[PDB]
Design brief:
The structure holds two protein chains of two kinds. By secondary structure, chain A is mostly helical. Helix content of chain A is 86%, strand content 0%. Chain A contains one helix and no strands. Chain A has one helix at 3-33. The longest helix of chain A has 31 residues, at 3-33. The radius of gyration of chain A is 16 Å and the shape is rod-shaped. By secondary structure, chain B is mainly α. Chain B is built from one helix and no strands. The longest helix of chain B has 33 residues, at 2-34. Chain B is rod-shaped, with a radius of gyration of 16 Å. The termini of chain B are far apart. Classes of the chains: A mainly alpha, B mainly alpha. Chain A binds chain B through residues 3, 6-7, 9-10, 13-14, 16-17, 20-21, 23-24, 27-28, 30-31, 34, and chain B through 2-3, 6-7, 9-10, 13-14, 16-17, 20-21, 23-24, 27-28, 30-31, 34-35. It is classed as structural protein. Keywords: structural protein, coiled coil domain, AP-1, bzip. It forms a dimeric assembly. Structure of cJun-FosW coiled coil complex.
């Protein structure tokens, strides 16, 4: 409801964006290993 | 114009987070199932 709120929501979104990228990368390593 | 720029950034991040979470969830299902066969 304000510039500050939008910027705080953006911060939250970009932290989530990071977490998904990291987890995706970790899942990809686990998935390749699951091919023995 | 700043407000409009931030609102568009919110929308863009949500859309991209939606794509990422969908990918993460696909991989979680594959990993979870392959790992517990």
């Amino acid at each position: 409801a304000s510039l500050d709120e939008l910027q705080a929501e953006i911060e939250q979104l970009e932290e989530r964006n990071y977490a998904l990228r990291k987890e995706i990368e970790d899942l990809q390593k686990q998935l390749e290993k699951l091919g023995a | 114009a700043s407000i409009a720029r931030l609102e568009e950034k919110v929308k863009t991040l949500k859309a991209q987070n939606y794509e990422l979470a969908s990918t993460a969830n696909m991989l979680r299902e594959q990993v979870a199932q392959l790992g517990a066969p």
